[PDB]
Amino acid sequence: APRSVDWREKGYVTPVKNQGQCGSCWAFSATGALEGQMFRKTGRLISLSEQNLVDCSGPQGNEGCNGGLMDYAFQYVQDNGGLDSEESYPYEATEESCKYNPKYSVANDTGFVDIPKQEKALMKAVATVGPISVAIDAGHESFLFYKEGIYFEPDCSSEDMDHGVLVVGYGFESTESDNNKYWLVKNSWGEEWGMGGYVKMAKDRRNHCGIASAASYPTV
Ligand SMILES: *[C@@](O)(C(=O)NCc1ccccc1)[C@@H](C[C@@H]1CCCNC1=O)NC(=O)[C@H](Cc1ccc(F)cc1)NC(=O)c1cc2ccccc2o1
């Protein structure tokens, strides 16, 4: 496995988005993973619709702006046999009735793979598959104020994640050893948060914040 991976510089990652005041972290996390896999499959990088996921994934168990799972979004894409593009079904940060139009479908998947809960497998999956959809514990106030460096909430939980985010790679900082490894994580709170909307999560520090607890990716 390589020592550093960054899927942004290879063209797998859409620009950073802003979810607003609606609990659709899962939707954005699912669309990023599916964008990565669609690009790997065809070489075409198309922003997908979070609103479609929010509005139409009800039957699969999701709760719109009131919570959602990324596996449930992949299941909705598979059952629905399609996912509209961001441009056709633009984000409105609210719950609305499903307006899916198969004419504007630009993505689909045949299921999803759940990663074993250990950071080594997460590293392997990120290296070989691409951006991976994950969950982390971000309820602590420190996460709200992140700016740069490796983020390390001493009170983070490894088994109770509440935020879905995407992992676009991993790397290390050139310091004198002292466990410098980090996960490159993309967030959905815009660009003015963290490093242009990104965060370096602590890597190989005993599954800090349960990043490797709920890792999965859609199979196209
Ligand atoms: C999410 O991190 C977020 O969007 N935060 C910003 C925000 C804006 C407005 C209001 C609140 C937060 C957050 C969103 C939920 C729902 C909205 C209300 N409060 C929240 O905390 N997290 C999730 O939505 C979460 C993501 C997740 C996925 C996978 C995993 F292993 C852990 C977490 N999913 C749920 O909370 C959830 C999912 C389901 C599915 C079925 C029934 C109930 C569910 O609850």
Q: Does the annotation flag 208 for ligand binding?
A: no
**71 labeled part of a ligand binding site:** yes
d(CA 127, CA 150): 20
Q: How far apart, in whole angstroms, are the C-alpha atoms of residue 158 and residue 140?
A: 13
Do the domain assignments include residue 127? yes
Q: Write out the two tokens for 86.
A: 């961001």
Atom number in ligand 1 closest to CA 214:
31
Beta bridge partners of 3: none
Query: Determination method here?
Result: X-ray
Both tokens assigned to 74: 């992949």
**Residue 185's closest CA among 176, 177, 195?**
195
Residue with the smallest CA separation from ligand 1 atom 23 is 67
Q: How far is the CA of 64 from the centre of ligand 1 (A)?
A: 9
Instruction: Give me the domain span that covers residue 27.
Output: 8-218
- The residue nearest atom 7 of ligand 1, judged by CA position, is 23
Residue 85: which of 140, 45, 41, 29 has the closest Cα?
45
Smallest CA-to-CA distance from 70 within 3, 135, 145, 138 is with: 135
Name the domain count of the chain.
1
Which of the following is catalytic: 22, 187, 208, 209? 187
Asked whether residue 1 is assigned to any structural domain, the reply reads no
Distance 187 CA to ligand 1 centre (A): 14
Domain contains 86: yes
**103: in domain:** yes
- The reported resolution of this PDB entry, expressed in Å, is 2.4
**CA pair distance 212, 165, nearest whole angstrom:** 12
* DSSP sequence for the chain: --S-EESGGGT--PPP-B--SSB-HHHHHHHHHHHHHHHHHHS----B-HHHHHHH-TTTT--TTB---HHHHHHHHHHHT--BBTTTS---SS-------GGGB----S-EEEPPSSHHHHHHHHHHT-SEEEEE---SHHHHT--SSEE--TT--SS---EEEEEEEEEE-SSSSSS-EEEEEE-SB-SSSTBTTEEEEE-SSSSGGGTTTS-EEE--
In a domain, 96, yes or no: yes
Is 172 contained in some domain? yes
Asked if 208 is an active-site residue, the reply is: no
CATH number assigned to the domain comprising residue 36: 3.90.70.10
CB 18 within 8 A of CB 156: no
Within-domain flag for 3: no
| 187 is known as an active-site residue | yes
69/91 Cα distance (integer angstroms): 18
**CA neighbor of 182 nearest in space, from 195, 194, 167:** 167
Tokens for 174?
């050139």
In a domain, 134, yes or no: yes
Burial class (CB in 10 A: 0-12, 13-18, 19+), 154: exposed
First vs last Cα of the chain: how many Å apart?
A: 23
Contacts of 38-45 with CB under 8 Å at 24 or more apart are: 38/106, 38/107, 38/220, 39/11, 39/12, 39/130, 40/12, 40/129, 40/130, 40/220, 41/220, 45/11, 45/12, 45/14
Q: Which one from 22, 62, 80, 163 is the annotated catalytic residue?
A: 163
Nearest residue to 135 via CA among 167, 170, 168, 165: 165
CA distances from 107 to 5, 24, 31, 85 (A): 25, 19, 10, 8
Q: Is 92 annotated as a binding residue?
A: yes
Ligand 1 atom 39 nearest Cα:
68
Q: Is 25 among the residues known to form the active site?
A: yes
Q: CA-CA distance, 186 to 98, in Å (whole number)?
A: 27
